[PDB]
Short mmCIF file of C-alpha atoms in Angstrom, two decimals:
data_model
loop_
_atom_site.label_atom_id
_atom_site.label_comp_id
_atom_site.label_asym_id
_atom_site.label_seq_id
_atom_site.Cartn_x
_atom_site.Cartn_y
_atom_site.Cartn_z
CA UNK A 1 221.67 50.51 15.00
CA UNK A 2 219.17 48.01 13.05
CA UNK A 3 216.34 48.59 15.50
CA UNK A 4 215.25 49.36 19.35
CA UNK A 5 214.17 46.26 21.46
CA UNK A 6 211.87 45.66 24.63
CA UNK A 7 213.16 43.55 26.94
CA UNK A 8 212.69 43.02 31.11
CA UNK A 9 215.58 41.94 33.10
CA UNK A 10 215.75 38.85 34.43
CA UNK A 11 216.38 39.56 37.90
CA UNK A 12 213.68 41.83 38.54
CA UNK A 13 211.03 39.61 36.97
CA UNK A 14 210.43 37.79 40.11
CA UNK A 15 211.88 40.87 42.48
CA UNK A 16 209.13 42.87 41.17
CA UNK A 17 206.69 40.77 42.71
CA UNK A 18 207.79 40.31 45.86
CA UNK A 19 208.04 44.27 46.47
CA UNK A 20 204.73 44.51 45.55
CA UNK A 21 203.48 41.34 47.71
CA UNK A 22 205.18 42.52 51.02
CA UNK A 23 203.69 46.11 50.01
CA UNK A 24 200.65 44.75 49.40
CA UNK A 25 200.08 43.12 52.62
CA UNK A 26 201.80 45.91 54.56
CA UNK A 27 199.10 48.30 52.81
CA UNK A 28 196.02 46.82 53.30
CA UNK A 29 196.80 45.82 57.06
CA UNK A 30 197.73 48.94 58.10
CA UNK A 31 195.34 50.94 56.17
CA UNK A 32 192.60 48.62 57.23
CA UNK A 33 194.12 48.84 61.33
CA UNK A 34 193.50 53.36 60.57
CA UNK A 35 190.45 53.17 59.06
CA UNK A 36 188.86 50.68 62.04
CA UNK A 37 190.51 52.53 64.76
CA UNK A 38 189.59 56.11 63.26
CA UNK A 39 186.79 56.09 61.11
CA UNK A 40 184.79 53.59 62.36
CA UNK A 41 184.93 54.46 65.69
CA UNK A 42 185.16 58.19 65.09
CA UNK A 43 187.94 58.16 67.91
CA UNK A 44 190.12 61.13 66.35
CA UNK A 45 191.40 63.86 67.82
CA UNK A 46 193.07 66.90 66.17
CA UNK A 47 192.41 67.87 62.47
CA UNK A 48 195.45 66.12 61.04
CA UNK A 49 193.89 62.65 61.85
CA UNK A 50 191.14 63.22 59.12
CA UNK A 51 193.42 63.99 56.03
CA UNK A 52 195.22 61.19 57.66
CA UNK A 53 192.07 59.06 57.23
CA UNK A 54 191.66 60.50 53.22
CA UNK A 55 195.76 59.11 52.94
CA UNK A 56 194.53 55.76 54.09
CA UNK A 57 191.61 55.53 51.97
CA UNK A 58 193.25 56.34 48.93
CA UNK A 59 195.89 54.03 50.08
CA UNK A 60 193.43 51.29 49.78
CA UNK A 61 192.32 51.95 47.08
CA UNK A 62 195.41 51.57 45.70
CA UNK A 63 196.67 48.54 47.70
CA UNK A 64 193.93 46.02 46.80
CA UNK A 65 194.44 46.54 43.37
CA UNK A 66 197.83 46.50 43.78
CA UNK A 67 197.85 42.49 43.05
CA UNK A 68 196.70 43.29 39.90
CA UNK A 69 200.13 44.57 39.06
CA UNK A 70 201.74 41.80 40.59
CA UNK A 71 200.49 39.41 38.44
CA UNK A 72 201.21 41.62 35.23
CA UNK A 73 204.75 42.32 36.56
CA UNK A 74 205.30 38.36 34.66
CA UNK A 75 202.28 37.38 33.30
CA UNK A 76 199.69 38.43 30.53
CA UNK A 77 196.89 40.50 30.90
CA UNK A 78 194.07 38.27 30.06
CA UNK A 79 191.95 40.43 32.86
CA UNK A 80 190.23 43.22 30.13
CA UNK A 81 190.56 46.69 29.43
CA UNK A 82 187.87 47.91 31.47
CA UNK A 83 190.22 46.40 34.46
CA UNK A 84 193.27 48.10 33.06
CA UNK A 85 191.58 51.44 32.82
CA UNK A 86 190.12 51.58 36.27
CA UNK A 87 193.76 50.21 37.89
CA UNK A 88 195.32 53.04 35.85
CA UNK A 89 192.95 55.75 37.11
CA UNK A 90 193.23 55.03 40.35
CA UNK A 91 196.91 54.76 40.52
CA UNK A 92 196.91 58.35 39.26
CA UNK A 93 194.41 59.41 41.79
CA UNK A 94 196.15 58.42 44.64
CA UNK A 95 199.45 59.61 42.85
CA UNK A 96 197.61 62.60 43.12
CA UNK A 97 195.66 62.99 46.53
CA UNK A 98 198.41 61.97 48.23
CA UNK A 99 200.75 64.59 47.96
CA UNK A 100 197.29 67.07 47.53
CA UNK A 101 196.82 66.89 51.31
CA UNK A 102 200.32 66.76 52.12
CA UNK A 103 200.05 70.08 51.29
CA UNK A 104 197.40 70.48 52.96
CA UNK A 105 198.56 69.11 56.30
CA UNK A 106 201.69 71.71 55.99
CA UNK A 107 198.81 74.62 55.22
CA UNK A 108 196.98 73.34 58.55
CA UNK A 109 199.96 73.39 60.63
CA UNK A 110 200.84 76.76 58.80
CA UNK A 111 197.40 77.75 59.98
CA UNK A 112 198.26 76.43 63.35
CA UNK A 113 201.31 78.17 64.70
CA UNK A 114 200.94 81.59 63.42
CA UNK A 115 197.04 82.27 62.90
CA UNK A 116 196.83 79.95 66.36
CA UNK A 117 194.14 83.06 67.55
CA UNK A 118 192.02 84.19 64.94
CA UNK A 119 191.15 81.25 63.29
CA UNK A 120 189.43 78.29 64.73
CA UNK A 121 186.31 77.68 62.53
CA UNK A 122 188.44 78.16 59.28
CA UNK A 123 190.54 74.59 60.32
CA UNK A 124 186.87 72.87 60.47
CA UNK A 125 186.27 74.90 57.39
CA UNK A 126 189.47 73.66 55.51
CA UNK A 127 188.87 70.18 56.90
CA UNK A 128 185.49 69.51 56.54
CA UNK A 129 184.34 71.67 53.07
CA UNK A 130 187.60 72.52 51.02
CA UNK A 131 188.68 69.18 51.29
CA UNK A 132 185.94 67.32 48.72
CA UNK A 133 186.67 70.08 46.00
CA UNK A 134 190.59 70.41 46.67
CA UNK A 135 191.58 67.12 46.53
CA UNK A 136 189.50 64.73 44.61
CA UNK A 137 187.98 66.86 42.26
CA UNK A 138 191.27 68.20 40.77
CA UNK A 139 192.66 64.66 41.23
CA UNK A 140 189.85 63.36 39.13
CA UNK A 141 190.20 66.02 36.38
CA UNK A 142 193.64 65.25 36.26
CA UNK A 143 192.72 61.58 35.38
CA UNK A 144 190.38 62.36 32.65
CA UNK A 145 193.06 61.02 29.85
CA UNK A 146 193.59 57.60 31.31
CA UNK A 147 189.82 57.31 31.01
CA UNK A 148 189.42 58.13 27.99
CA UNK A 149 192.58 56.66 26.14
CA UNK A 150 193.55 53.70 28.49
CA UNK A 151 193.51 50.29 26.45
CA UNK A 152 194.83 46.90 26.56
CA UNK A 153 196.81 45.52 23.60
CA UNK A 154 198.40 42.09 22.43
CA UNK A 155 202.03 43.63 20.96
CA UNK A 156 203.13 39.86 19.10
CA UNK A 157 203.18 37.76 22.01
CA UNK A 158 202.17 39.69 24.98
CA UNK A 159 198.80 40.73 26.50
CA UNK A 160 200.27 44.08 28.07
CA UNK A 161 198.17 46.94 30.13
CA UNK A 162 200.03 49.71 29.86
CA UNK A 163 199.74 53.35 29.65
CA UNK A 164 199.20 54.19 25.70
CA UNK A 165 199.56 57.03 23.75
CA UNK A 166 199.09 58.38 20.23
CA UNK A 167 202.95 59.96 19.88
CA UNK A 168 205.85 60.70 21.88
CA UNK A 169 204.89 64.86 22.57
CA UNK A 170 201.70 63.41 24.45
CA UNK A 171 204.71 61.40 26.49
CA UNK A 172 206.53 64.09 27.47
CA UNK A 173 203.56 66.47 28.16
CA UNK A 174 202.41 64.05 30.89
CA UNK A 175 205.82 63.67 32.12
CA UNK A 176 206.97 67.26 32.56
CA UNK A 177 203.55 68.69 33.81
CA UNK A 178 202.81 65.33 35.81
CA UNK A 179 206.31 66.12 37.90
CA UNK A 180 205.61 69.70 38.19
CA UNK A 181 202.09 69.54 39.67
CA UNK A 182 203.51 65.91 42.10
CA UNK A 183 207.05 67.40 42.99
CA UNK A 184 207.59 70.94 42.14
CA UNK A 185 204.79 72.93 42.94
CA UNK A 186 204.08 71.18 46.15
CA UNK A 187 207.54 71.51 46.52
CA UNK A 188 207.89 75.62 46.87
CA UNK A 189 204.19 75.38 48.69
CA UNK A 190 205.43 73.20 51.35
CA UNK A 191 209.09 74.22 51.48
CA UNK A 192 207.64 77.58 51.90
CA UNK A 193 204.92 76.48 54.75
CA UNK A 194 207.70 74.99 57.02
CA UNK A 195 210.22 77.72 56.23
CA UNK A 196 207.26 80.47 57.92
CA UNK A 197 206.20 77.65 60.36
CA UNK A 198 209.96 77.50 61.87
CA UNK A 199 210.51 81.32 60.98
CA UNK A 200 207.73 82.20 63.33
CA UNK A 201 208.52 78.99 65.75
CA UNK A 202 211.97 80.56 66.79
CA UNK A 203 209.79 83.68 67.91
CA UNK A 204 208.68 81.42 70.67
CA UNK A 205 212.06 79.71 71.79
CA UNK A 206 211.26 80.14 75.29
CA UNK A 207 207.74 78.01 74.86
CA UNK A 208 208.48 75.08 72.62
CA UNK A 209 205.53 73.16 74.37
CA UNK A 210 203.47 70.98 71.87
CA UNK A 211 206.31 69.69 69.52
CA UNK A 212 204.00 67.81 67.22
CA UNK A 213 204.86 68.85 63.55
CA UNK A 214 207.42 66.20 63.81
CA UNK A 215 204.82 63.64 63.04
CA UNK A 216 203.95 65.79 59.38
CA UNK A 217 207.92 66.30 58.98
CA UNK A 218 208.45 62.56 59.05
CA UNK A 219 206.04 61.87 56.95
CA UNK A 220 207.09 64.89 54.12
CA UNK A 221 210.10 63.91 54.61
CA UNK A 222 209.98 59.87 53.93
CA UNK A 223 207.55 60.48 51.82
CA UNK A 224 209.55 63.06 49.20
CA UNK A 225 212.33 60.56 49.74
CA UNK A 226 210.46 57.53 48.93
CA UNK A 227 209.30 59.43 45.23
CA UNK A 228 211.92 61.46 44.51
CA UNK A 229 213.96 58.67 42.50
CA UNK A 230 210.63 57.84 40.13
CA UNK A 231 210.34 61.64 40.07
CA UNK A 232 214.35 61.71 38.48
CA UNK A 233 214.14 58.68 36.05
CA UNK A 234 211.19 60.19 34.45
CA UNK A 235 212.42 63.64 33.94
CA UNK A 236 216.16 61.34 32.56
CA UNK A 237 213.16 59.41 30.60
CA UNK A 238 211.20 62.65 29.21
CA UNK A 239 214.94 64.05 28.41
CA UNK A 240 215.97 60.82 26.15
CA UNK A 241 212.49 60.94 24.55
CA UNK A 242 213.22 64.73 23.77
CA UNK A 243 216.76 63.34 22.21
CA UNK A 244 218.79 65.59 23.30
CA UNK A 245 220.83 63.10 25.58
CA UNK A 246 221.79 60.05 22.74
CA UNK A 247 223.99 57.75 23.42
CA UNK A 248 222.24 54.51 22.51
CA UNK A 249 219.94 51.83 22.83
CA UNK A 250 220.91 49.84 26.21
CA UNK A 251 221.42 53.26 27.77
CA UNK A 252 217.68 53.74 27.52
CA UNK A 253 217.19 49.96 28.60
CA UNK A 254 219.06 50.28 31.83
CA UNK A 255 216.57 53.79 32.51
CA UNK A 256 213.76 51.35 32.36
CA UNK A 257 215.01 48.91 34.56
CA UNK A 258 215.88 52.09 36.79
CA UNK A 259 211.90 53.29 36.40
CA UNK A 260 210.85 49.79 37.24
CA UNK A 261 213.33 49.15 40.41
CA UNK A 262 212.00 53.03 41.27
CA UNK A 263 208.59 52.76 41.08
CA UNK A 264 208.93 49.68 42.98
CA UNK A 265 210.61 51.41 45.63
CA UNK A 266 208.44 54.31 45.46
CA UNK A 267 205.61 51.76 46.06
CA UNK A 268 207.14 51.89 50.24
CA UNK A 269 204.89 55.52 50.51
CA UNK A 270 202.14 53.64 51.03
CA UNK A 271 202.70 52.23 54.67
CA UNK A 272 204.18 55.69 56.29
CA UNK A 273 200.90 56.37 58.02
CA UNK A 274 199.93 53.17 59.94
CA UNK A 275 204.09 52.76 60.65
CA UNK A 276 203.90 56.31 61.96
CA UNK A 277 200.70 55.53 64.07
CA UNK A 278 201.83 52.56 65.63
CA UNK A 279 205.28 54.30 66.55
CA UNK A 280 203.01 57.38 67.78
CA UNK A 281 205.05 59.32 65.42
CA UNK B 1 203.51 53.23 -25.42
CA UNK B 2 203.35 51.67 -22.36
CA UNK B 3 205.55 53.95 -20.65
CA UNK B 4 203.82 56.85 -21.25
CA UNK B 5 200.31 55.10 -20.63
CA UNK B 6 201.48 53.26 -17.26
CA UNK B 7 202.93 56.05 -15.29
CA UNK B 8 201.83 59.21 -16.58
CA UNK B 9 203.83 62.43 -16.01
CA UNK B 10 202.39 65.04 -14.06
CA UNK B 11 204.42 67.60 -16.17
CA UNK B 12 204.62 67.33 -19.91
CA UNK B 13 208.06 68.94 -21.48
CA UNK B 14 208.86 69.99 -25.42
CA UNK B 15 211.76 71.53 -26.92
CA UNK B 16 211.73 75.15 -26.38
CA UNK B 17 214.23 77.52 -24.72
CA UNK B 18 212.06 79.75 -22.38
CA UNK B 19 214.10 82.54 -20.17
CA UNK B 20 213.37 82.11 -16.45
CA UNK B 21 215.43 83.39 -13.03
CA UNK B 22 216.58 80.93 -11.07
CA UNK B 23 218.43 80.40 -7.82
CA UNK B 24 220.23 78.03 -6.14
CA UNK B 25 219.96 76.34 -3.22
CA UNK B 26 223.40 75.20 -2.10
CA UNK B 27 223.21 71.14 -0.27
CA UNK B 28 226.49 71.53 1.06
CA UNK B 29 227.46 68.17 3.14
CA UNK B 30 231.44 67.77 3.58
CA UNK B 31 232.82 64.50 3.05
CA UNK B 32 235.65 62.74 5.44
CA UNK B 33 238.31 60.73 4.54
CA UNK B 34 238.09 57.87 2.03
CA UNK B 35 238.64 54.86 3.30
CA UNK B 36 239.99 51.87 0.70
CA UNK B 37 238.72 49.06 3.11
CA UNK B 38 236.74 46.47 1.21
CA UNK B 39 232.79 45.93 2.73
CA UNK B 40 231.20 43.48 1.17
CA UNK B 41 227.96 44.77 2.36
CA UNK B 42 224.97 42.65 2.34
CA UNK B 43 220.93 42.76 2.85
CA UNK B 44 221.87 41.73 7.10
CA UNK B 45 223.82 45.17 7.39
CA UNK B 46 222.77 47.59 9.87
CA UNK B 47 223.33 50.45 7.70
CA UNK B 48 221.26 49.53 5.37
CA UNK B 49 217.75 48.73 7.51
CA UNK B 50 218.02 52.20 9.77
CA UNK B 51 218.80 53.72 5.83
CA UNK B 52 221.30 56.19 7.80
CA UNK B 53 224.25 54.45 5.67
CA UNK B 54 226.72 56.22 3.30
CA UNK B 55 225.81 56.84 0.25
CA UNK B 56 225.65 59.83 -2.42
CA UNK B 57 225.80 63.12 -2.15
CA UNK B 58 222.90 65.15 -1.58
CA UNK B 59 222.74 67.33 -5.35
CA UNK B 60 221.57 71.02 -5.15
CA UNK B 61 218.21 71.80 -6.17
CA UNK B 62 217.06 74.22 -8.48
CA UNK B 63 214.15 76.77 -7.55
CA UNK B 64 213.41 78.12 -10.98
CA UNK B 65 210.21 80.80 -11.89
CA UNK B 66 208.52 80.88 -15.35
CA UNK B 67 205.73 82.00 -17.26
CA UNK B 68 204.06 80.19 -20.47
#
């Protein structure tokens, strides 16, 4: 090999868009449809509905700067680095928050079918109080390094906001403990949630009544599938910038088309509340 | 003159035999088989701008102790 190269496919640069366009429009309508009919109106009913509110405001929050993207997906990023930071930021937070009270919906149904007696002002407790220093502080601690090292740059040619950093460890650190506290650990604390909730569920074969975790098991469910792809390419990413799987330079190309054509993909999550709500699912 | 003025040694040497104990480091790298194909091998190479291209043989170094 002379050198390594950077180089988008052509295909994508004008798929990538229109992903995140439909997305885009798909988010903030149905986000902004929740939010009027829930919050607004303070027409909820059980305890879900709230962290269900918390997914669609983070959602936003994402979605409308979403376009952001889409124009960076082909063009330059004449916008600034202040702009860059705070669109980085927040796409961690909601990374973050999202799958935070995901958890936390599988804990409250936990909660529901098998402490269903002695506890009724702990789910107001756990809804109301935990939530503000469970989710969004940790998810903003979490996102003190793309504060604090976010930065624009002109590489030759392009204006490009992207995530930066000093060396390749600091890659691989983020990568490995950013899928273990997204994936894994949520994994084994959910997994484990809905392995007691149907352990104790079969108990009560002969009253099956309610039925209405299969709103929450939708939504883990086409939710873990919608990630899970990003989640692979960037443990195959953090495993060729370890080098301990060489084989060469286009290899590593084709994994970044794969990250882009996953994240893009990945971007879906977004609209599986409002969907889900106007199914009554 | 200008030798010695331009770049100066960091180590000064004059002739005298001085016992010391020294051991060596063995750089063993094994060679495959020679190949008589002519390369005319120019500055546009690969080989030459990763500098992971064959060339000599790594010598074994010396570790030596003294006192003077």
């Amino acid at each position: 090999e002379p050198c390594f190269r950077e180089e988008n496919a052509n295909f994508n640069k004008i798929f990538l868009p229109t992903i995140y366009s439909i997305i885009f429009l798909t988010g903030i309508v149905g986000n902004g449809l929740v939010i009027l009919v829930m919050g607004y109106q303070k027409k909820l009913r059980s305890m879900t509905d709230k962290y269900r509110l918390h997914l669609s405001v983070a959602d936003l929050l994402f979605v409308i700067t979403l376009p952001f993207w889409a124009v960076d997906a082909v063009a330059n990023w004449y916008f600034g680095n202040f702009l860059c930071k705070a669109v980085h930021v927040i796409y961690t937070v909601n990374l973050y928050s999202s799958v935070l009270i995901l958890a936390f919906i599988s804990l409250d149904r936990y909660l529901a079918i098998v402490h269903a007696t002695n506890s009724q002002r702990p789910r107001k407790l756990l809804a109301e109080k935990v939530v503000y220093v469970g989710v969004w502080i940790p998810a903003l601690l979490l996102t003190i390094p793309d504060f604090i090292f976010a930065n624009v740059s002109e590489a030759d040619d392009r204006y490009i906001c992207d995530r930066f950093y000093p060396n390749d460890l600091w890659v691989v650190v983020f990568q490995f403990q950013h899928i273990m506290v997204g994936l894994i650990l949520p994994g084994i604390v959910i997994l484990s949630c809905y392995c007691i909730i149907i352990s104790k569920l079969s108990h009560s074969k002969g009253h099956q009544k309610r039925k209405a975790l299969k709103t929450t098991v939708i939504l883990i469910l086409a939710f873990f599938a919608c990630w899970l792809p990003y989640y692979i390419g960037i443990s195959i990413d953090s495993f060729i910038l370890l080098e301990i799987i060489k084989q060469g330079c286009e290899f590593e190309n084709t994994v970044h088309k794969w990250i882009s054509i996953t994240e893009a993909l990945a971007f879906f999550h977004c609209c599986l509340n409002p969907i889900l709500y106007a199914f009554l699912g | 003159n200008l030798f010695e003025t331009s770049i100066k040694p960091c180590v000064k040497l004059t002739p005298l035999c001085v016992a010391m104990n020294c051991t060596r480091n063995m750089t063993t790298s094994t060679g495959t088989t020679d190949t008589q194909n002519i390369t005319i091998i120019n500055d546009t190479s690969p080989c030459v701008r990763a500098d992971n291209c064959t060339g000599l043989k790594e010598e074994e170094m010396v570790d030596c102790q003294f006192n003077m």
